[PDB]
Design a protein around this ligand. Structure first.
Ligand SMILES: [Zn+2]
Length: 363
């Protein structure tokens, strides 16, 4: 087995290839920093296409290049278990002994290991636990939490699994193995890429309306769903394949963003056999009936409004951008600005929704 890769993470620049997310979290990645040779884990996130991060130290939250220096590291998982000898599995902290006895190795750097407080009211936080003191620390809001004892039991830590592949692996060895019962996937699959990277080969991006658009002047007819962040706010927008390279456009804060976009997340449609839901684009009034829990808009949640992918009709043309269904607003980046629709004007939007398969439950 290769050792873990902690990839180079210059603060204020885009993420490295294949960063490892905190399980289940939209914009939270496993991160590592050192002070005087001593490792500690923390968290990184995307803001405006680049790395921001937070670590607990000296009972303070350190976030700056001035607190931290110019670079941290972000856990990377590039390749698969055939070339690496391991895959990462998130387990309950209380299960670590059983897991180690079955042959798993716990991810660690010195005495520090990542720990995810998944069920924390108001949102998960990723922090670190100290092997010697068994205290977990989490940095946020300029403060540090410290938690120990039984409150750790259901928090999640990373195990390296040294045998086989992960549950949905499609490498030739896993493909040839005798099938095992799976839970179908109920989380939307989002892949990390930087704008200007080569077009994705590892999955199937989700195309506006499932077809070429009759779109606006200067836009590519084949537009696909992507997520970016501005000031901690989720922004859905569009990517297209520009000469083999990812190109993107987002609208937010009254502006259009078409360059220096950096790190984005691309939505993938999983293989039908492993997914617990199907996608389709639905008229806004149908999409708004999410309460029935039949077709539910794809959404990333934020306190200012939850944001969904949406094709708008502008000047009689179709164009991929974003909508807040509950607040009846929808926008695109276009023409050097953010074009905004509200109220009844959003009812013509087509919203990306998903519907749970029988036996499955989604939100
Ligand atoms: Zn495999």
């Amino acid at each position: 087995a290769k050792e873990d890769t902690w990839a180079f993470g210059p603060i204020g620049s885009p993420f490295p290839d294949n960063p490892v997310k905190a399980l289940g979290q939209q914009n939270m990645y496993v991160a590592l920093w050192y002070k005087n040779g001593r490792p500690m884990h923390g968290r990184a996130w995307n803001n405006g296409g680049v790395i921001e991060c937070s670590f607990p130290y000296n009972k303070s939250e350190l976030t700056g290049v001035k607190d931290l220096g110019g670079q941290i590291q972000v856990l990377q998982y590039k390749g698969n278990h055939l070339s690496l000898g391991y895959w990462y599995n998130w387990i309950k902290y209380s299960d670590r002994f059983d897991k180690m006895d079955k042959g798993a190795e716990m991810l660690r750097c010195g005495d520090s290991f990542p720990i995810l407080w998944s069920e924390r009211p108001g949102g998960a936080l990723l922090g670190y636990a100290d092997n010697k003191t068994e205290i977990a620390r989490f940095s946020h809001d300029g403060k540090v939490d410290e938690v120990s004892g039984s409150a750790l039991a259901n928090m999640l830590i990373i195990a390296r699994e040294l045998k086989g592949g992960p549950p949905y692996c499609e490498c030739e060895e896993c493909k040839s193995e005798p099938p095992k019962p799976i839970v179908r996937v109920t989380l939307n699959e989002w892949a990390d890429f930087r704008c200007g990277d080569p077009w994705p080969t590892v999955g199937t991006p989700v195309r506006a309306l499932g077809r070429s658009l009759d779109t606006l002047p200067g836009e590519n007819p084949d537009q696909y769903v992507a997520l970016w962040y501005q000031s901690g706010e989720p922004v859905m927008g569009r990517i297209w394949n520009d000469g083999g390279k990812i190109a993107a456009c987002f609208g937010w804060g009254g502006h259009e963003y078409r360059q220096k976009i950096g790190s984005i997340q691309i939505l993938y449609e999983l293989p039908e056999a492993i997914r617990g839901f199907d996608y389709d684009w639905k008229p806004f009034p149908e999409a708004a009936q999410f309460g029935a829990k039949e077709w539910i808009p794809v959404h990333v949640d934020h306190h200012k409004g939850n944001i969904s992918p949406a094709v708008l009709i502008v000047d009689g043309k179709e164009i991929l951008g974003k909508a807040d269904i509950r607040n009846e607003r929808a926008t695109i980046g276009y023409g050097g600005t953010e074009k905004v629709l509200v109220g009844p004007a959003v009812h013509s939007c087509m919203v990306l929704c998903r519907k749970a398969k029988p036996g499955c439950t989604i939100d």
